[PDB]
Amino acid sequence: SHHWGYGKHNGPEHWHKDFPIAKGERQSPVDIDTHTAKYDPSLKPLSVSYDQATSLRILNNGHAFNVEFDDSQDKAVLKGGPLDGTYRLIQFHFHWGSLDGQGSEHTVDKKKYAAELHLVHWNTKYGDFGKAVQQPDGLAVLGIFLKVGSAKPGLQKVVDVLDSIKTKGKSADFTNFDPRGLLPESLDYWTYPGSLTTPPLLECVTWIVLKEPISVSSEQVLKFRKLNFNGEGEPEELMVDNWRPAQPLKNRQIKASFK
Ligand SMILES: Cc1cc(C)nc(SCC(=O)c2ccc(S(N)(=O)=O)cc2)n1
Ligand SMILES: [Zn+2]
């Protein structure tokens, strides 16, 4: 049993052996060189319509925790921005560090943030998530950086349920969670074509990364770091440093919605 993860012998530098697309032409994350990102006056404002989002459950999957949504109806949708058509929210999750100085997957002029939130959405033209990931425009992931400072009040219900899903394969009911509480004020963004940042690393993602980070407290991110990558009754491996580092841009162009 030598499944992928985030250590010496199974972390990101090992993934190409099971998932050769790891060395592909549109892999994520990337460093966002803000001086080289082209302002693109044809980009539209991002449309985030989360009023009717229905969260269902929260799950420790052994790599992160996912807050899952009902996506059987057109309720929590992302559109506009660089996108054609309409993408439905299915789950969100985070990547974070063992220390405040690292943890994000994307970087901004090589700056690492303490964590990074991914709101994952699938293109409704493909009928469901599983079919969507097989298509080059199947997913739109909205990435939002976290820095440590003042608490994010909208985050606290998530933080408070983590002790209930400490270990791999634990889940809990998680209804009426409103993801609008996790958004910064500005929807200014950079966008580029890339991939899922975990295996299977499929090249199916339009990345939209917001320029404005949200602030979370030290106590909030400390609670993320009390999670476990192991299952109950196994030796404790703290769930930290579950981020993939920046991958080669390979001449793709990152576009900015601003400036
Ligand atoms: C492709 C695929 C098919 C099935 C049946 N399950 C999963 S779990 C991995 C995943 O859902 C996922 C979603 C978003 C990201 S990210 N980190 O790029 O936002 C990474 C993995 N993935
Ligand atoms: Zn992610």
CATH number of the domain to which 19 belongs: 3.10.200.10
Q: Which ligand is nearest to the CA of 208?
A: 1
Cβ-proximal residues to 66 (8 Å cutoff; 6+ apart), any chain: 58, 59, 91, 92, 93
Ligand 1 pocket, CB under 6 A: 118, 120, 130, 133, 141, 196-198, 200, 202
Helices (H) and strands (E) counted in the chain, each on its own, are 4, 15
Q: Using CA positions, which residue lies closest to atom 15 of ligand 1?
A: 196
- Give the structural domain span for 205: 1-259
Q: Residue 121 is encoded by which pair of tokens?
A: 């959405």
In the chain, the number of structural domains is 1
Return the closest-CA partner of residue 154 out of 93, 218, 222, 220: 220
DSSP string covering 192-225, please? EEE--SSTT--S-EEEEEESSPEEE-HHHHHHHT
In this structure, are residues 93 and 65 in contact, taking their beta carbons and an 8 Å threshold? yes
Other Cβ atoms less than 10 A from the Cβ of 35: the count is 5
In angstroms, the CA 15 to CA 90 distance is: 25
Query: Exposed, middle or buried by CB within 10 Å (0-12, 13-18, 19+), for 137?
Result: middle
Q: Enumerate residues with CB within 5 Å of ligand 2 (an ion).
A: 118
The residue count for the chain: 259
Give the method used.
Answer: X-ray
Kind plus residue range of the DSSP H or E element containing 30: none
Coil/strand/helix, residue 86: coil
Cβ-proximal residues to 166 (8 Å cutoff; 6+ apart), any chain: 60, 226, 227, 228, 232
In this structure, are residues 132 and 204 in contact, taking their beta carbons and an 8 Å threshold? yes
Partners of 111 in beta bridges: 108
Cβ-proximal residues to 110 (8 Å cutoff; 6+ apart), any chain: 31
For 111, which DSSP code?
A: B
In this structure, are residues 197 and 11 in contact, taking their beta carbons and an 8 Å threshold? no
- Resolution attained, angstroms: 1.6
